[PDB]
Each structure stands twice: as structure tokens, then as C-alpha cells.
Ligand SMILES: N[C@@H](CCCC[NH3+])C(=O)O
Ligand SMILES: N[C@@H](CCCC[NH3+])C(=O)O
């Protein structure tokens with residue numbers, strides 16, 4: 001199977017005057033490229049995919065694809081939807097417009113059964129010939145892709161090559177890789193990046209790397225080379241910022257940190273997301289002082 | 297405040313050859329009107345709102361409005377979205393096309409903070425002049441409208457008159473009505489319709505009433521008339537069917553039952569929803585036999 005692994009960033013989507021700041025988006029992607037990241041994920045959860053129009057979603061995939069041409073960096077395009085018809089449409093767009101693969105979140109809100117999840121992902125995977133990474137985040141979807149469903153999709157669909165796990169369940173990661181060691185398990189939870197990598201996970205899709213791309217890339221590459229002492233030391237170092245970035249719902253804290261770092265121009269969200277509380281604003285600012293934040 | 301209360305049905309959406317079966321939809325609503333129902337909710341969760349196009353979503357509200365015209369049955373239109381811009385758009389469409397009010401689910405997947413929910417619902421309420429019913433179902437959205445937020449919205453915005461509570465938390469229902477007894481608490485969980493009504497709830501938005509509109513209307517009307525003995529007797533009677541209708545994720549069981557009763561033409565869903573297992577198919581059919589199902 002063709003795969004997309006390594007250190008990857010779930011890119012934030014910056015806004016200016018209620019519109020996607022497209023120049024800022026391209027600049028942020030180049031900062032990721034220049035700090036050792038292996039792939040970028042435009043318009044995932046961290047990118048506010050729920051509040052982007054279909055047009056904006058497509059534009060952000062194209063900017064990422066265009067910005068990564070001539071580099072080793074891949075584009076794993078966010079293409080999930082709780083309607084299979086729309087997920088297939090986004091998958092086909094990403095494939096036709098030069099993405100290296102797609103991320104596809106488990107359907108949210110409508111809680112499909114395991115049989116429904118299987119048919120959803122099989123319809124997506126059959127619609128394109130690029131790699132597909134499943135994405136399990138039950139705290140946000142109300143749904144869970146069981147280990148059995150994940151393994152069946154991996155074995156039955158040629159292009160489904162792994163899963164991004166954001167469930168905080170290390171037993172499930174042992175279960176997955178013990179029964180199917182060929183799949184690419186990708187960490188979707190920054191605080192436990194190293195435990196997942198040390199059990200044979202092959203990458204991370206990181207929120208923290210928006211702010212500290214060099215540290216997340218280093219952790220991942222240390223771990224992939226089995227330099228576990230160095231990988232754990234960075235994962236330990238990053239614990240405080242990894243937690244503070246979820247004091248409020250992602251991406252409110254990371255966008256706050258990017259603004260406090262002077263990386264984005266305005267602290268703008270699309271409703272129902274909004275800026276954090278005054279208290280959390282101060283907590284994020286205080287934790288940031290313990291880290292060295294690269295500029296442009 | 298202007299209000300919409302009493303026995304209400306979260307209407308299923310029947311499909312025929314992959315399209316909304318519009319004459320069947322109108323026939324099902326008329327069956328409701330004639331079985332004592334007080335209001336219908338087109339395109340809620342039970343109506344597969346996630347997998348309808350924006351056009352289809354609007355068509356179903358219009359069919360509901362025509363079919364209920366010249367009757368005292370009200371239309372509480374499903375108008376929720378996890379993007380405030382789209383929720384405002386659906387609320388305005390519902391007002392302009394004659395709905396009596398709107399149901400608006402808390403944003404799913406993107407987990408807004410309490411401040412975000414307040415601003416989300418305040419934007420919806422200010423966009424129209426018809427009643428707005430909040431809708432709390434954290435098992436599907438990943439977020440909860442706290443009691444404090446609900447009461448603040450009730451007190452601050454004119455059209456916000458209550459909440460449909462599908463959280464299985466009767467303590468929260470005591471909390472709500474002890475601190476704000478003027479609000480309309482609406483049951484969104486069929487098995488506990490009677491406990492919510494007996495604590496001062498004023499209506500139900502029911503899945504079960506799709507199949508048994510007469511029994512759910514009677515339950516609600518007994519309770520509102522303070523005949524708790526009779527309301528409880530129907531709630532007890534309905535427990536087995538009320539639970540079996542969630543053997544798999546709603547609306548898969550209710551659509552299955554509607555098909556087994558001969559009330560819709562095809563057991564068709566839009567992916568990622570799909571037919572139940574054949575074990576669950578047999579369980580639903582077995583539980584239905586103990587209930588008398590009205591025809592057309
Ligand atoms: N808000 C809807 C539509 C988003 C479509 C574009 N990303 C959802 O989250 O599914
Ligand atoms: N599937 C998207 C779009 C639905 C739009 C029509 N109700 C969502 O659940 O938000």
C-alpha cells in the first residue's frame with residue numbers, strides 16, 4: 001500500500017474580515033515545510049471544516065497542494081462528512097486537484113452503525129485511487145469505528161492504509177497493531193504522541209505542531225528511528241503545552257497561541273466558535289513562555 | 297412568550313429510488329394530524345437531516361406547512377446546524393415559508409464553548425420573530441448546553457421559549473424547572489416521556505409517535521391534564537417499543553418499523569445510515585406485534 005506517515009500538521013484556517021486569509025494560509029504552510037514537517041492536513045477539525053463553505057474547503061486544499069509542489073511535503077486533504085455522498089465528493093475533488101491522500105472523519109451526529117461505517121468508507125475508498133486515512137474521534141462524532149471495523153476496511157480496501165486515533169485509548173492501539181501490524185496507526189492526540197509511536201504507530205497529525213513544528217517533527221523522527229529516549233524527552237517537555245491547547249475546544253486555544261505568537265493577524269473564529277475566556281487567554285500566554293516559538 | 301407544546305412527532309423522511317418520497321411524506325403527516333398530534337417536526341435527527349440536501353430540507357418543511365394548513369397542528373421546523381451561518385439561514389427560511397417555530401440542535405462535532413452556544417443561539421433568535429426551541433442531545437453532538445446557558449438564553453432572547461432535552465438526565469430537568477419554571481421543557485427521550493411531563497414538562501418530540509401517534513398523544517394529554525395515573529400507564533406500556541426503537545441508532549429502527557407496518561414503501565436510508573442487522577430486524581418485528589398500529 002501507498003502511505004502518508006511521519007510528522008503532520010492539522011493546519012489552522014486563519015480568517016481576516018470574515019474571509020479565509022489565503023496569503024496567511026500559504027505563509028503558514030511554508031513555515032511548516034521549513035521546520036521539518038512531513039505532511040499537512042488542510043481543513044480537518046483543527047481547520048474549522050464545519051464552518052467553511054464547500055467553496056472555501058476546496059480553496060484551502062488547492063492552496064496546500066500548490067504550496068507543497070517541489071518539496072517532499074505531502075498533502076493529506078481533510079475530506080470527511082457525515083453524509084457519504086458529500087464525503088465521496090470531497091474525496092474526488094482532492095484526488096482530481098492533486099492531493100496525496102485524504103483524511104476522512106467518522107460521520108458525526110447521525111451515529112451510523114458499524115455496518116454503515118464500513119459502507120461509508122468503502123464508498124469513499126472505491127471512488128479514488130489515493131491513500132485514505134480513517135479518523136476516529138468519538139468525543140466529537142458520538143461514534144466509534146471499532147477495531148474490527150478498522151481492520152476489515154484495511155484488509156478489504158486497497159487504499160485504506162491506517163487510522164488517525166483521537167480517542168485516548170492506548171489499549172485500542174495495542175489491539176489494532178497486535179491484530180493487524182501492517183496498518184499505519186497515526187496519533188491524533190498530542191499528549192500521547194510518544195506512547196503511540198513507541199507501540200509502532202508511524203506518525204502524528206498534530207495540533208501543537210501549528211505552534212511548535214520543529215519539536216513535533218523531531219519527536220516523530222526520533223521515535224521512528226527508535227531513539228526512544230530522545231522522543232520521550234520531547235513528549236515530556238511538550239506535555240504542558242499539549243494539555244493547555246485543549247483547555248477549551250480545539251482550535252480555540254491553538255489559534256489563540258498562534259495569535260499571541262504573532263503568526264496570525266487576528267483572533268477570528270466563525271461562530272459557534274469564539275475566542276477563549278480571559279482566564280484561558282492568560283493561561284495559554286503563560287504556558288507559551290516555556291517554549292521557543294519559531295517565526296517565519 | 298409564544299410557544300409550541302404538546303405531543304409532537306419527529307417525522308421520518310421516506311425515500312423512494314434515492315429521492316424524497318413527497319406524497320408518502322404528506323400522507324404520513326396527515327396520519328399524525330388525525331391521531332391527535334399537536335405539532336410535527338420535519339427534518340430533525342429522526343428525519344435524517346444530515347443527509348438531505350439544502351433543497352430537500354427546505355422541501356420537507358414546505359410539505360409539512362401545506363399539509364398542516366387549515367388544521368391546528370403546528371409545524372416546528374428542524375433548522376439546526378453546527379455552522380451558525382447555516383442555522384440562521386434555515387431559521388429565516390422556516391419563518392418566510394410559514395413554520396410556526398423552529399427546532400435548533402446544539403452544534404455537533406465542533407464542540408463550541410458555552411459562550412459560543414449563547415452567541416450561536418442569540419444569532420438565530422435575533423434573525424426571526426417566531427419561537428425557537430433549543431435542542432440538547434450530547435450523545436450525538438459531543439457538547440452540552442448547560443442549565444445556566446439555557447436559562448440565560450431563555451431570559452435574554454424573546455423567542456427562545458424552551459428546550460428539547462434528549463440527555464437522559466432527569467436531575468437536569470429538575471434543575472431547569474426549579475430555577476426557571478416558566479420555560480417549556482420538551483421530552484426528546486421517549487422512554488422517559490412521563491417522568492419529564494410529571495415534573496412540569498409541557499410536551500414531547502417523539503420518535504415512537506411515528507408508529508403510535510395515538511398512544512403518544514394520549515400519554516401527553518393525560519399528563520397535561522394531570523391524570524398521571526393514566527399517563528404513567530401508557531408510558532409503562534410503551535417502554536418495550538420505546539427501547540427497541542433504539543436497538544440501533546435512530547432512525548434505523550423506526551423506519552424499519554414503519555416499513556414493517558406497511559406505512560412506507562421502501563426500507564431506504566441515505567448512507568452512512570443503512571438497514572439494521574437481521575437479528576435487530578427480527579427483534580423490532582417481534583416487539584411491534586404487542587401494539588395496535590393505526591393505519592391511514
Ligand atoms: N457544517 C456542515 C457542512 C460543512 C461542509 C464544508 N466543510 C458539516 O460540518 O458537515
Ligand atoms: N451533512 C451536513 C449538511 C446538512 C445540510 C442539510 N440539513 C450536516 O449535517 O451539517
Ligand SMILES: [Mg+2]
Pocket residue numbers: 053054055056
Ligand atoms: Mg464560499
Ligand SMILES: [Mg+2]
Pocket residue numbers: 225
Ligand atoms: Mg535516521
Ligand SMILES: [Mg+2]
Pocket residue numbers: 045046250
Ligand atoms: Mg480535536
